[PDB]
């Protein structure tokens, strides 16, 4: 999974109000070039969305689960066919749960203490949520004492500061409303513009 984060460098944090809405936005995101799609569990029946997108994995898409708050949520994600589990917080039961099932897990971290707690669970890749607050200087301050740690910021990442994040040395970035909000045409166009923008940041 780390090989794909380093490959595509962008993740689509997908929020919606219905299964029909989340499926349409995921198709437009993939047609725009973004292969890493994170289906949040705030979507009603998010497990149904992930399973009904199993055909996109044949095209080359990576469908995962986001905003996973409980263990009971984690099974419905893994059993539906999620290829990576994402949460805005650090949960020790979920980390060990995906550990034994064989699914990659990315916990949400904001404090150096919480990063150490997640490192003791084996996680070298962390979700920096909310990056809107800690900023890229947080990633730079952690490269010293924790050089083996890679980050994926989420929240507060737009086309203005996406070069700021990759300059600090982040692995990938997660985009929410700045990519997913809009019509299928606007979502596909927003994905192409973000793919070209990141291609200009990592040059």
């Amino acid at each position: 999974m780390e090989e794909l984060f380093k490959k595509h460098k962008i993740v689509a944090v997908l929020r919606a109000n219905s299964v029909e809405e989340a499926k349409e936005k995921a198709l437009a995101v993939f047609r725009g070039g973004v292969h890493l799609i994170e289906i949040t569990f705030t979507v009603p029946d998010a497990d149904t969305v992930i399973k009904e997108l199993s055909f996109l994995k044949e095209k080359g898409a990576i469908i995962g689960a986001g905003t996973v708050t409980s263990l009971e949520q984690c099974q419905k994600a893994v059993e539906s066919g999620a290829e990576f589990i994402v949460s805005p917080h650090l949960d020790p039961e979920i980390s060990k749960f995906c550990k034994i099932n064989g699914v990659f897990y990315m916990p949400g971290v904001m404090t150096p203490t919480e990063l150490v707690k997640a490192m003791k669970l084996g996680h070298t890749i962390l979700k920096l949520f909310p990056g809107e607050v800690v900023g890229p200087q947080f990633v730079k301050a952690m490269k010293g004492p924790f050089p083996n740690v890679k980050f994926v910021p989420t929240g507060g990442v737009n086309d203005q500061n996406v070069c700021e994040w990759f300059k600090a040395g982040v692995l990938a970035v997660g985009v929410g409303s700045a990519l997913v909000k809009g019509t299928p045409e606007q979502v596909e166009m927003l994905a192409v513009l973000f793919v070209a923008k990141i291609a200009g940041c990592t040059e």
Binding site: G33, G182, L193, G200
Partner: protein, 136 residues
């Protein structure tokens, strides 16, 4: 022989005999139907001759042979914009940017097409992309 008529159509275009150059590119296409260079050059001559929908047909034929030519998708976006098909031009300019994210002309022209289409949000993103590429 196919490249000979292409080279003939080129020289005829150096001397601005465009209609005769298009006839030479046509003969080279009759020789080798899969000469993607002859199709692209024919579409450029027809665009100059303002045979617009005929040029977009030639650009589409060349793109079918060269799926990943950023300048071909870009020149197709020029013809589709001149034809009024703003939605088709925006999709063509998007394919050219997906192929070459460093094309400042394709990013600026996409911003012009999106602004004419009404997408002020997407056009401003494309304009900022063209400003970052071209420092002028």
């Amino acid at each position: 022989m196919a490249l000979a008529y292409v080279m003939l159509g080129l020289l005829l275009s150096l001397l601005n005999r465009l209609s005769l150059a298009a006839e030479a590119y046509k003969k080279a296409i009759e020789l080798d139907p899969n000469d993607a260079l002859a199709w692209l050059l024919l579409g450029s001559v027809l665009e100059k001759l303002k045979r617009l929908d005929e040029a977009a047909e030639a650009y589409k034929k060349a793109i079918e042979l060269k799926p990943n030519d950023a300048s071909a998708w870009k020149e197709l976006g020029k013809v589709l914009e001149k034809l009024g098909r703003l939605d088709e031009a925006a999709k063509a300019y998007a394919e050219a940017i997906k192929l070459d994210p460093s094309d400042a002309e394709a990013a600026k022209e996409l911003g012009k097409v999106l602004e004419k289409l009404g997408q002020l949000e997407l056009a401003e993103r494309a304009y900022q992309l063209a400003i970052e590429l071209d420092p002028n």
